[PDB]
């Protein structure tokens, strides 16, 4: 029950249930696939630029 | 005329290409003396004068 509350909705479904789990989904897919071909359906907030 | 990494929608497409042909006044001139003018605020690796 404690795992269900903590790892699912701890009174925070949008912010906690699937935001850290999204990071876990990205970490596990980056662990399986070193390339980002599979990670194309998974958006990221990407900061790029010059000097 | 100064070199530009990206032609802007505010400049006609051939602006960098025309500047490069003009830049040959020294690139192909053994008798030319070049004052290379880096911007102090921007980092040394960012400037296009280097190439």
């Amino acid at each position: 029950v404690l795992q269900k509350d903590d790892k699912g909705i701890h009174h925070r479904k949008l912010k906690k249930s699937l935001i850290d789990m999204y990071s876990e989904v990205l970490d596990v897919l980056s662990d399986y696939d070193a390339s980002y071909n599979t990670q194309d359906h998974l958006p990221r907030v990407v900061v790029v630029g010059d000097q | 005329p100064g070199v530009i990494n990206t032609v802007t929608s505010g400049m006609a497409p051939d602006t960098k290409e025309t500047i490069f042909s003009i830049s040959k006044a020294y690139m192909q001139n053994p008798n030319a003396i070049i004052l290379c003018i880096q911007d102090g605020s921007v980092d040394a690796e960012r400037s296009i004068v280097t190439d």
Side-chain angles (χ1 to χ4, degrees):
Chain A
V1 177
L2 291 174
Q3 289 180 71
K4 287 179 182 181
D5 301 341
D6 300 346
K7 296 177 179 177
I9 305 169
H10 205 270
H11 328 297
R12 285 164 38 72
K13 62 180 180 295
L14 269 71
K15 307 156 196 303
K16 208 187 190 282
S17 187
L18 62 161
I19 314 307
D20 303 64
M21 183 176 282
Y22 183 61
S23 309
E24 296 178 350
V25 158
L26 270 53
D27 302 328
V28 175
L29 186 51
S30 63
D31 178 74
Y32 165 46
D33 293 307
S35 66
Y36 297 68
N37 290 260
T38 50
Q39 301 160 65
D40 284 352
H41 299 79
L42 299 163
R44 285 189 179 88
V45 176
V46 186
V47 174
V48 295
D50 329 310
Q51 306 300 273
Chain B
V3 62
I4 51 105
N5 195 270
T6 184
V7 172
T8 53
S9 178
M11 288 195 305
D14 308 330
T15 310
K16 56 200 175 181
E17 299 174 353
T18 312
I19 293 152
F20 186 84
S21 296
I22 290 156
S23 287
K24 292 174 175 290
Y26 61 87
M27 294 188 298
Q28 305 180 178
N29 189 334
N31 296 330
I33 289 167
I34 305 164
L35 310 182
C36 304
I37 327 299
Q38 165 84 40
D39 190 359
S41 27
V42 296
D43 197 63
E45 289 177 0
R46 205 187 172 279
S47 291
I48 313 158
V49 64
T50 53
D51 308 359

